[PDB]
Amino acid sequence: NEDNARFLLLAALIVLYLLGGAAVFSALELAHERQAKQRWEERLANFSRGHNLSRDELRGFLRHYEEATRAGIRVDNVRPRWDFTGAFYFVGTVVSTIGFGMTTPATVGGKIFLIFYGLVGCSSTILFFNLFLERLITIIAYIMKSCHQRQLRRRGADSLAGWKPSVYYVMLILCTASILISCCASAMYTPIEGWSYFDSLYFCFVAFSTIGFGDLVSSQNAHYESQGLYRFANFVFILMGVCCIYSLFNVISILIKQSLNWILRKMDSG
Amino acid sequence: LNEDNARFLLLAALIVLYLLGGAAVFSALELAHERQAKQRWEERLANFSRGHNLSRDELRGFLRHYEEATRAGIRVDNVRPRWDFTGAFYFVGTVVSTIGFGMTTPATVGGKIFLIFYGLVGCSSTILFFNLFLERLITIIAYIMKSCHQRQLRRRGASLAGWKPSVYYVMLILCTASILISCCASAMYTPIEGWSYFDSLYFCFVAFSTIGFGDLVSSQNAHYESQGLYRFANFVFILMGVCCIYSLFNVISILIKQSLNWILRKMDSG
Ligand SMILES: *[C@@H]1O[C@H](CO)[C@@H](O)[C@H](O)[C@H]1NC(C)=O
Ligand SMILES: *[C@@H]1O[C@H](CO)[C@@H](O)[C@H](O)[C@H]1NC(C)=O
Ligand SMILES: *[C@@H]1O[C@H](CO)[C@@H](O)[C@H](O)[C@H]1NC(C)=O
Ligand SMILES: *[C@@H]1O[C@H](CO)[C@@H](O)[C@H](O)[C@H]1NC(C)=O
Ligand SMILES: [K+]
Ligand SMILES: [K+]
Ligand SMILES: [K+]
Ligand SMILES: [K+]
Ligand SMILES: [K+]
């Protein structure tokens, strides 16, 4: 009954966390939401007044443009989707469960194949992230044991892997690595995309956490400088960042499980 | 080469080949539809320009304004207010579950900082919740088989649970439960939203696999019938479906790890 108690405690804590985050986000951005909607209403009113346009025909034109935007075409020189380069980035967002929504299937067969393709690839890439976390554990353990061996040799003048890093040490290493990759990717995105550095950090966290809002997406607009190299760099940075942030999520999940066990042990005593 | 390193490299190569093949087939399936939709959009824009006597630059500026509005949450057909507490709850649910449809995206500098700091803990806690749900599903299935064995022994006569179900049985149970949950959620979404049943199934897979394209989002348009019941039912179905598909991804990841071990044993033998 200790595992059921831990499950119920985690569910209650997550529900309370959801409520608190909803309240904080509402308090933070309801004013911005209202101001942006008011600015859009003012712009639409000026557009209708200046050019003598009815609201119904403008609404129909906006419906047509929404249908166009769902098809991938945008205002300012976005790359053509569903070519081999664009479909590769779409597949990278599908299989890594990022799913920006920059590229969505419209055919019936495309969505069926997306269902099967996700069912296989997303599982294989969850396995890939777990294997990457295990290899990072092994690499950190090997580095620590090699440093210990070098220290022993300097003083003197099978499975192995006896030394294992603590979960706090792995959290620190993964946090530092993710911060470094986010900073490097943002330093590449800022002069190329024109984003603010904080906007690039936010996009890096969103993509690396497999959240993928799609409000900011890296390589969508066309006519890049060194387009072949930039696409590869974006793919590699996104891959390492998603790996590191998902591994950090697993490590923090282990730590939160330990915290829940400690909380249950506190209430078990009295 | 190490056994784990060889498995890691083999999985990376298999995933890269999978991405290449999926990109090729997705391009082949969707490029014609994308070209047709872009041609339709260009025809509609030309009709709007030549009918209402509107310059291309002025329409481009108006569409830029509409894009800035849609980024806030403006849609052409009566969607719910954004960043209200009910909407912020949906957004936070999409954040912590790593779904991230993008119906509601932060634009405030403080909002995105809070998204990063909040979503770290939220996504880690929710991945831990998925792992705990999978473990509890294992325990429940094992308890069901134990109860069936006790019932058949009592009829024939007239912690334990060491015996755990095989990964094949868990895969079958999870995919059956996932199909049932997706069918129930789609049967809910089809009359409420007006989506096709296949479109509702596709949205169910996208939401439940935490891919979250955002092309289809469930409770966005306003003025539902019994909003409090529908929003709660949508949240419950999304939670259970995401848990089932994420646990299914974990189980298929275990299966693919076993297959990779078998392949490596095949190469090790000769
Ligand atoms: C819209 O309303 C009037 C029209 O000239 C103007 O004063 C106002 O600044 C306009 N706002 C925008 C955003 O165009
Ligand atoms: C606006 O367009 C309508 C439709 O042609 C017309 O009846 C009306 O007179 C126009 N208003 C102007 C030009 O102020
Ligand atoms: C839109 O443009 C196409 C291309 O000329 C034309 O065939 C069609 O009739 C137009 N539609 C309307 C409603 O004018
Ligand atoms: C609209 O029609 C008038 C006709 O007098 C013309 O002078 C003008 O260039 C056209 N275009 C715009 C954007 O006003
Ligand atoms: K995800
Ligand atoms: K995930
Ligand atoms: K996602
Ligand atoms: K997404
Ligand atoms: K999205």
Author numbering:
A (entry chain A): 14 to 170, 185 to 297
B (entry chain B): 13 to 170, 186 to 297
Which statements did the authors publish about this structure?
The TWIK-related Halothane Inhibited K+ channel (THIK1), named for the early observation that halothane and other volatile anesthetic (VA) agents inhibit THIK1 currents (1), is a K2P channel expressed in microglia (2), primary immune cells of the central nervous system (CNS). pmcTandem pore domain (K2P) potassium channels play vital roles across human physiology, conducting noninactivating potassium currents that set cellular resting membrane potentials. In response to inflammatory or infectious neuronal cues, THIK1 mediated efflux of potassium ions from the microglial cytoplasm modulates activation of the NLRP3 inflammasome and pharmacologic or genetic disruption of THIK1 activity decreases inflammasome-mediated production of the proinflammatory cytokine IL-1β. The overall structure of the THIK1 channel follows the canonical K2P architecture, featuring a dimeric channel assembly with a domain-swapped cap domain at the extracellular face of the channel, positioned above a central pore formed by the TM2 and TM4 helices.
To facilitate cryo-EM structure determination and anesthetic photolabeling studies, we purified a C-terminally truncated version of THIK1 (KCNK13), bearing residues 1 to 309 of the THIK1 protein sequence. Using cryo-EM, we solved a 3.2 Å structure of this THIK1EM channel construct. Our 3.2 Å THIK1 structure is in a putative closed conformation, due to the presence of an occlusive pore gate constituted by a pair of inward-facing TM4 tyrosine residues positioned directly below the potassium selectivity filter. Inwardly opposed Tyr273 sidechains arise from the pore-lining TM4 helixes and meet within the pore to form a central occlusive constriction ~6 Å below the THIK1 selectivity filter. In the presumed closed conformation we observe in the THIK1 structure, the Y-gate tyrosine residues limit the size of the ion conduction pathway to a diameter of less than 2 Å, precluding passage of potassium ions to the selectivity filter and dividing the inner pore into a large lower vestibule and a much smaller hydrophilic chamber directly below the selectivity filter. The cap domain of THIK1 contains two predicted N-glycosylation sites at Asp59 and Asp65 and in our THIK1 cryo-EM map we observe density consistent with glycosylation of both sites. Consistent with this notion, we observe EM density between the S4 selectivity filter Thr110 and Thr237 residues and the Y-gate in our cryo-EM map of THIK1. This “S5” site density is equivalently spaced and linearly aligned with the S1 to S4 potassium ion binding sites, and we therefore modeled this density as a potassium ion. A five-residue sequence, from Gly189 to Ser193, crosses the distal TM2 helix and adopts an inward-facing orientation previously unobserved in other K2P structures. In the THIK1 cryo-EM density map, we find a curved lipid-like density buried within the core of the THIK1 protein, directly behind the selectivity filter.
